[PDB]
């Protein structure tokens, strides 16, 4: 689950 990924994809 967690938090939305803040890094570039």
């Amino acid at each position, epitope marked *: *689950d*967690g*938090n*939305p*990924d*803040p*890094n*570039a994809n």
Partner: antibody
Amino acid sequence: QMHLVESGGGVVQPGRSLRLSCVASGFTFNNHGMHWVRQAPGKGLEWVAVIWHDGSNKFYADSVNGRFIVSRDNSKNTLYLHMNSLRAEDTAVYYCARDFFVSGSYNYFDPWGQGTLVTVSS
Amino acid sequence: EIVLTQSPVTLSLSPGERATLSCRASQSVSNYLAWYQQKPGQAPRLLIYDAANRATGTPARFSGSGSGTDFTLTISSLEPEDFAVYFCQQRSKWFTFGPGTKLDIKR
């Protein structure tokens, strides 16, 4: 080598404003979310704020939401923290930290800067 | 907020002994837990992430495990540089840290 260096800390009166900066080198700054984390004197660590790699989203700890604003200038490889409505309880060393990601994991803090000390007092 | 509690609050051991540090979350954080080391006057350093993965440069004597609410950091054969403060951190619901366990040298 990867490196983060903060600046801008100092003594600030409650109610006043202060801007912190964090300059990055040694990694691709625009690929990473960036974080602010703080540590009150002799206390533990408290996450402060996160900003998306492209600056599109910003989230804040409950204790600073609405009073602190996080921003970044990828052209300068720099992260900012705009601290308004400062209170004595905001006294802490402020660290900037990169969002460390590998494989499917993310949202850990590596590397860290050396920290900058903000002292809020009248 | 997800509260992380660390036990024992302090640990006193001799070099060469094994240290066992516990972190308990107030609700399940899956395996989204990291461990950090901090020495006086220095910034924290990432040691373990995703409960059990060693970060680059973390020596083999550091190992972590756990899931849900209960997590364990083990330091085998303590070296003098290992005596420091250790924080756990979850990233399941935003980001919170434990208050730290201080490991000092038993004399």
